[PDB]
């Protein structure tokens, strides 16, 4: 039984959430923000990512060089990432360097220069990032997957934004973005590891007290996405490995089917030919794929957003003449979530997940990420006892009902990259979403 | 000159992104009225001469031959028929 997550608020509406671990010597403190690229329109798309660069370019007090030195002197590091719905800025340090790190984070978020000279400098760095993501195949595949599934909608936009916007982002629109979005009621200060909650609350009162509150304070993790069945083919015969993602519209964080969808995902599971144990996994798809050498890997996912999600699988394969078999057998295993699954598969997947949801949190950064994610999506940290009860409530017959309304005979979003000549047209893929025998 | 799926015999393909949408997501008869009128008119107009010229020539030839044959086997065509045989 892990120590209890303590939670306090400030007057502005900033949440402070902490989980202490007296066995470790480091601490991850940071700011989780319920805001990301999805909050941009088409004209300022890329702003959130642009700001992440300039946050480390110097403040009203410390210059870029002074900033570098201050963190070097602390001994730990700072890190940041911007997603579609979430922005994170954290600092890993020593136990007694926590007041320094909170002070630096408060500075870069509230009091950043955003000097025209630095905007102009980063504008090239970010332009170069557009031509180097091209190598990260998984990211290419998932960005096209969002673009097509949420065609012409805010969730469909990339985080980097178009080339055109990068050239036209001003300090004015940067300032406007962070003033509108980085408000106290949307922010959570998180501490995990060697942190005292009461000390962290005092540091929040000292540094984050003059944060703006939004005009209309909605609860944390408050949002209509209209999924498009569609495909993107990025054929490249010179690549040796095909990368394919297939997804349906999945579930939001607060869906009643959230846990049902996780169990369904665990029934298919993951596979990697490079891992020794993968040939012996219980998953039927794993067995088919390994015995027939159909793939190098597959990874089931159930990605959630505030008001929608994507549920599907990501495949990589060198077997270019049997892509058809790989996709065929994958979708036939999904069909069985509707037609065939019983207590045998469901109880097995529940066993595996009851541990998996706890295992994931193995370092202070993972714990902080868990507290921060849950507070910004659900408005609260869900205790392991509650999670164990929600998993236990999932029956085989919940899974069947969920798959019958979510997967069975449904439109898919499909992205193929690489030597995908063997990937059949949309209809033949989508025809495998049902079984004529059932 | 033809392989099979995965090795069809295409030159290497690169740089083309292809997009489409589900049959359930699309209106199958989108723009049908425009196509039925304007597209068909364009399509037909561009091919009209290749049908009209040979059809009209061979129909004219037939018409002349059949009319002559008919006339040759009347009373009036007696003399011309006698020469023709």
- The DSSP symbol for A415 reads E
Residues of B in contact with A232 (CB under 8 A): 17-19
> Which of B22, B24, B25 is the best mutation test for A, with the most CBs of A within 10 A?
B22
Closest CA to A400 of A349, A339, A350, A356: A339
Architecture (CATH level 2) of domain A6-208: 2-Layer Sandwich (3.30)
Residues of A in contact with B4 (CB under 8 A): 321
B7 to A320: CB separation less than 8 angstroms, yes or no: yes
- CB atoms near residue A394 (< 10 Å): 23
Token readout for A275 is: 């891992």
How far apart CA A295 and CA A246 sit, in angstroms, is: 15
- CB atoms near residue A381 (< 10 Å): 19
Across A227-260, b (16+ Cβ under 10 Å) vs e yields bbbbbbbbbbeebebbbbbbbbbbbbbebebbbb
B23 to A228: CB separation less than 8 angstroms, yes or no: no
Residues of A in contact with B22 (CB under 8 A): 228-230, 411-412, 426, 430
How far apart CA B80 and CA B76 sit, in angstroms, is: 9
Residue in the structure block whose two tokens are 């498009």: A228
Number of residues assigned to chain A: 438
- Positive or negative: CA dihedral A282, A251, B18, A47: negative
Whether A291 is catalytic = no
Chain B stretch 40-59, residues whose beta carbon is closer than 8 A to a beta carbon of chain A: none
Find out whether A421 and B10 touch, Cβ atoms under 8 Å: yes
How far apart CA A82 and CA A129 sit, in angstroms, is: 15
B23 to A427: CB separation less than 8 angstroms, yes or no: yes
Q: A–B: how many Cβ contacts below 8 A?
A: 66
Token readout for A75 is: 């001994």
């Amino acid at each position: 039984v892990s120590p209890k997550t303590r939670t306090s608020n400030l007057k502005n509406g900033l949440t402070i959430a902490s989980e202490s671990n007296p066995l470790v010597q480091t601490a991850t403190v940071g700011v989780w923000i319920d805001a990301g690229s999805r909050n941009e329109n088409a004209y300022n798309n890329g702003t959130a990512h642009f700001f992440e660069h300039l946050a480390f370019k110097g403040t009203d007090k410390r210059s870029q060089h002074q900033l570098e030195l201050d963190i070097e002197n602390m001994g730990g590091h700072l890190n940041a990432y911007t997603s579609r719905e979430s922005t994170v800025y954290y600092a890993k340090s020593f136990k007694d360097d926590v007041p320094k790190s909170v002070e630096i984070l408060a500075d870069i978020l509230q009091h950043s220069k955003l000097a025209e000279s630095a905007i102009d400098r980063e504008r090239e760095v970010i332009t170069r990032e557009l031509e180097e993501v091209n190598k990260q195949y998984e990211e290419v595949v998932f960005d096209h997957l969002h673009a097509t599934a949420f065609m012409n909608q805010p969730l469909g936009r990339t985080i980097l934004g178009p080339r055109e916007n990068i050239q036209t982002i001003t300090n004015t629109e940067l300032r406007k973005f962070i003033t509108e979005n980085y408000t106290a009621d949307r922010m959570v200060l998180v501490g995990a590891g060697a942190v005292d909650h009461d000390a962290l609350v005092e540091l929040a009162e000292k540094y984050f007290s003059h944060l703006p509150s939004s005009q209309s304070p909605v609860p944390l993790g408050t949002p209509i996405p209209n999924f498009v069945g569609s495909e993107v083919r990025l054929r490249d015969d010179t690549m040796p490995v095909a990368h394919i993602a297939i997804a349906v519209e999945g579930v939001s964080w607060t869906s009643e089917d959230y846990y049902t969808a996780l169990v369904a995902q665990a029934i298919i599971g993951n596979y990697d030919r490079a891992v020794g144990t993968s040939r012996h996994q219980g998953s039927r798809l794993s067995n088919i794929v390994s015995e027939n050498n159909l793939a190098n890997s597959f990874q089931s996912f159930s990605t959630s957003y505030s008001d929608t999600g994507l549920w599907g699988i990501y495949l990589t394969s060198e077997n270019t003449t049997q892509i058809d078999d790989l996709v065929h057998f994958t979708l036939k295993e999904w069909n069985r979530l509707s037609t065939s699954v019983s207590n045998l598969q469901v109880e097995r997947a529940k066993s595996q997940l009851k541990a998996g949801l706890l295992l994931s949190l193995d370092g202070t950064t993972y714990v902080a990420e868990d507290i921060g994610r849950q507070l910004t999506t659900l408005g609260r940290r869900v205790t392991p006892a509650e999670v164990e009860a929600k998993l236990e409530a999932v029956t085989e017959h919940d899974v069947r009902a969920w798959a019958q309304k979510t997967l069975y005979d449904k439109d898919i979003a499909l992205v193929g990259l690489g030597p995908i000549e063997g990937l059949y047209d949309y209809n033949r893929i989508r025809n495998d979403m049902s079984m004529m025998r059932w | 000159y033809m392989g099979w799926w995965g090795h069809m015999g295409s030159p290497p393909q690169k740089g083309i992104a292809g997009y489409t949408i589900s049959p359930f997501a699309a209106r199958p008869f989108a723009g049908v009225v425009h196509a039925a009128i304007f597209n068909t008119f364009r399509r037909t107009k561009n091919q009209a001469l290749f049908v009209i010229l040979p059809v009209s020539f061979f129909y004219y030839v037939w018409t002349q031959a059949s009319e002559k044959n008919e006339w040759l086997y009347t009373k009036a065509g007696r003399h011309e028929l006698a020469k023709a045989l």
